[PDB]
UniProtKB/Swiss-Prot annotation, chain A:
Name of protein: Vacuolar protein sorting-associated protein 30
Cell location: Endosome membrane; Vacuole membrane; Preautophagosomal structure membrane
Quaternary structure (record): Component of the autophagy-specific VPS34 PI3-kinase complex I composed of VPS15, VPS30, VPS34, ATG14 and ATG38; and of the VPS34 PI3-kinase complex II composed of VPS15, VPS30, VPS34 and VPS38.
Family: Belongs to the beclin family.
Note: Present with 2490 molecules/cell in log phase SD medium.
UniProtKB/Swiss-Prot annotation, chain B:
Name recorded for this polypeptide: Vacuolar protein sorting-associated protein 38
Gene: VPS38
Assembly and interaction partners: Component of the VPS34 PI3-kinase complex II composed of VPS15, VPS30, VPS34 and VPS38.
Residue window of the full protein shown: 197 to 245 of 439
Disruption phenotype: Abnormal reticulophagy.
Localization annotation: Golgi apparatus, trans-Golgi network membrane; Endosome membrane
Domain of life: Eukaryota
Function: Involved in endosome-to-Golgi retrograde transport as part of the VPS34 PI3-kinase complex II. This complex is required for the endosome-to-Golgi retrieval of PEP1 and KEX2, and the recruitment of VPS5 and VPS7, two components of the retromer complex, to endosomal membranes (probably through generating a specific pool of phosphatidylinositol 3-phosphate allowing the recruitment of the retromer complex proteins to the endosome). Mediates the interaction between VPS30 and the VPS34-VPS15 core complex, leading to the recruitment of VPS30 to the membrane.
Residues in coiled coil: 27-49
Any further remark recorded for this protein: Present with 1070 molecules/cell in log phase SD medium.
Family from the record: Belongs to the VPS38 family.
Length: 50, 49
């Protein structure tokens, strides 16, 4: 009977671990956007240099 | 042959009155071994978890 609660806690742990994935995606989106913006800023800076 | 059958009844009575439950406790002991093994498996699963 003691195994059951452990199983349930394992499931809750699975969901809690399943949230961090979407969290991580939402995170990395900002990194990608930062990369693109960095590229644009680089090009713009080159143009300013011209 | 009938007397031999009575002797067979005496032999059956001998084998029956020989011993009470013994190996049954060994089966229950095997079940207990399965319980301890399940404890090791649950402890391992707890370790991995």
């Amino acid at each position: 009977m003691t195994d059951d609660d452990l199983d349930g806690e394992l499931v809750r742990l699975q969901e809690k671990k399943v949230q961090l994935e979407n969290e991580k995606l939402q995170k990395l989106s900002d990194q990608n956007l930062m990369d693109l913006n960095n590229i644009q800023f680089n090009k713009n800076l080159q143009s300013l240099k011209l | 042959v009938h007397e031999e059958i009575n002797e067979i009844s005496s032999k059956i009575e001998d084998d029956f009155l020989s011993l009470k439950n013994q190996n049954h406790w060994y089966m229950r002991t095997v079940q207990k071994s399965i319980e301890t093994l399940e404890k090791e498996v649950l402890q391992r699963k707890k370790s991995k978890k």
